[PDB]
């Protein structure tokens, strides 16, 4: 009745079921273990786990229509704003044993809960420190193909830019979840999104921009490339 299928993106999967609508899924990096109480399917020599889109915006953005997705099998990536890492579990599945994942968090106690889970998910490294200050973890990170930002502090444009000075390779990609209301609450979100576009386009090239409506409100996803 259920069927597991490939998505239009390398390493990303889809399930269809007893209602028959598409749900987003990943091929489990460590078969048998749970992370958040996910929906799962065991299969012909394999196991597949679902990402519920109401649990992280990046799932909802892929359902809405995000097309320029750069996180792919065997790539190297640095991510800021991970907490206990439900997001990180699904990019751990998509990237596999061939790649490299760093996850940086500023909230000190919520990162603690990921520490035993990475003893199985050994393609993730969890790191405690201020996402706005790259120098505070400089010895335990390397150059990467991709950066992702979803701390989405008031500083988040500097979080993305300064980590992309230090760690992003030439030709490499960036992603940012622009939390309009935490950068400036005094103006219409399209003015906030226009300053984020005009600051990022003085260092990166912008390749795609998405408002999360009609799924969620006043938050946006931007994706970019360094020359």
């Amino acid at each position: 009745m259920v069927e597991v299928k490939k998505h239009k993106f390398p390493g990303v999967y889809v399930v269809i079921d007893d209602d028959g609508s598409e749900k987003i899924a990943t091929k489990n990096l460590v078969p048998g273990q749970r992370v958040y109480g996910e929906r799962v399917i065991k299969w012909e020599g394999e196991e597949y786990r679902i990402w519920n889109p109401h649990r992280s915006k990046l799932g909802a953005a892929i359902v809405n229509g995000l097309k320029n997705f750069p996180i792919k099998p065997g790539k190297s990536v640095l991510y800021l704003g991970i907490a206990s890492g439900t997001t990180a579990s699904h990019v751990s599945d998509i990237v596999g044993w061939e790649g490299k994942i760093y996850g940086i968090e500023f909230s000190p106690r919520v990162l603690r809960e990921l520490v035993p889970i990475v003893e199985e998910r050994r393609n993730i490294i969890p790191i405690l420190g201020d996402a706005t200050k790259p120098e505070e973890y400089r010895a335990l990170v390397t150059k990467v193909d991709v950066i992702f930002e979803d701390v989405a502090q008031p500083t988040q444009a500097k979080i993305l830019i300064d980590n992309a000075k230090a760690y992003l390779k030439r030709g490499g990609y960036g992603m940012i979840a622009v939390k309009s209301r935490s950068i400036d609450v005094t103006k219409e979100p399209e003015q906030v999104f226009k300053e984020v576009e005009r600051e990022l386009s003085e260092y990166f090239e912008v390749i795609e921009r998405l408002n999360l409506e009609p799924y969620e409100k006043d938050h946006a996803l931007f994706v970019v490339r360094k020359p």
Binding site: K100, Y102, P108, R109, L111, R112, V115, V118, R122, I125, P126, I127, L128, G129, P134, E135, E136, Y137, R138, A139, L140, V141, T142, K143, K165, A166, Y167, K169
Partner: protein
């Protein structure tokens, strides 16, 4: 000019070649946190003094505040994060640490994340004692559930009991196999058994005298084995907790009053043996000096307090409270000095709680 990573410390010139490299003389997370947050450590200090012996007078580092401490140490120091030493190490780590490099980055990154939070107990050795009693109680309940697991799985494969004597190897076998037809050379060699042990088991699977448990039954015996492997993982978390907890050891007087009063009471008793041999009704008046002297020689006014006077509730409070707190404080200090001399075991958060409670009682009274 200089840069640092997970395994060491490296100096490269302004054209881009290596001058010298060092490795850390203490556990890497413990040294790297200091170098990451912006302060100097002896291994980086010995490298930058080697560059000063080799005749380099100007220095360029990665972190703005490590650079600030480097000029305060007497050097022409500045900051430029894109510099060749760090740019090479972070661009081509396989040139310096080899094609396994991410495994050492991982091993210290998770350890730094375990270290970037404070650790301060009131009862650390008593917590270790309960962890030691837990380690014998955990091994004892593993033995109990393994005795049931042996007997119940012997209904479905009775030849296994004599054949796998090692208890966690029997647990992990039943956890991953469940039903007896999932037994293959591949899964036994992943579980790390020898080619000899695999020349049996498979020979017995083709001829077993055991009964039949259904798929619906045998998963219950698989779940029993899975919860015993949960207990074996808890067993390691107890062993690894004690391996950390034995670093948090301290003296009591440093926590109950601190050095300004602790080292004064030791010096006015002449030593810490002598302070431990003193009564509360002399510890109250140690360092009263001219007031104790003339209370003796001329029979003058008895000293209400000595060097204890600058305590957090004496030199800053009404006269009604100043006299009562002085002798209560000297009582709790006479306990604390005897603890720190005769046994050296830590209880000082309870000695603090009792001196919170007696001063709260002085508050409901006065």
């Amino acid at each position: 000019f200089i840069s640092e990573n997970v395994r060491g410390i490296y100096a490269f010139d302004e054209n881009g070649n290596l001058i010298e490299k060092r490795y850390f003389t203490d556990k890497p997370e413990k040294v790297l946190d200091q170098l990451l947050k912006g302060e100097i450590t002896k291994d980086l200090e010995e490298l930058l003094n080697s560059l000063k012996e080799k005749g380099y007078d100007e220095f360029v580092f990665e972190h703005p505040e490590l650079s600030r401490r480097a000029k305060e140490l007497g050097f022409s120091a500045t900051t430029e994060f894109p510099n060749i030493a760090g740019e090479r190490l972070r661009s081509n780590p396989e040139e310096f640490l080899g094609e396994n490099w991410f495994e050492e980055y991982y091993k210290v990154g998770v350890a730094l994340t375990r270290m970037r939070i404070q650790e301060q107990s009131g009862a650390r050795d008593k917590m270790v004692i309960q962890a030691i009693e837990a380690l014998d109680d955990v091994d004892k309940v593993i033995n109990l559930l393994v005795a049931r697991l042996r007997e119940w799985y012997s209904l479905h494969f009775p030849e296994l009991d004599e054949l796998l004597p090692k208890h966690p190897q029997y647990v992990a076998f039943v956890k991953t196999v469940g039903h007896r037809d999932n037994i293959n050379e591949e899964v036994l060699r992943e579980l790390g058994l020898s080619e000899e042990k695999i020349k049996k088991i498979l020979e017995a699977k083709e001829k077993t005298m055991g009964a039949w448990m259904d798929q619906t039954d045998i998963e219950v015996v698989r779940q029993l084995a899975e919860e015993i492997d949960r207990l074996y993982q808890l067993r390691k978390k107890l062993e690894d907790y004690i391996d950390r907890a034995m670093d948090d050891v301290a003296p009591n007087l440093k926590a109950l009053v601190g050095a300004k009063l602790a080292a004064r009471l030791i010096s006015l008793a002449g030593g810490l043996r002598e302070l431990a041999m003193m009564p509360s009704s002399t510890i109250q008046v140690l360092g009263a000096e001219k007031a104790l002297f003339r209370h003796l020689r001329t029979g003058a006014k008895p000293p209400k307090h000595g060097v204890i006077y600058q305590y957090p509730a004496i030199n800053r409070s009404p006269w009604w409270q100043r006299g009562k707190i002085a002798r209560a404080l000297a009582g709790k200090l006479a306990i604390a000095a005897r603890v720190d001399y005769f046994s050296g075991e830590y209880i000082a958060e309870e000695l603090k709680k009792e001196l919170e409670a007696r001063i709260r009682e002085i508050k409901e009274k006065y």
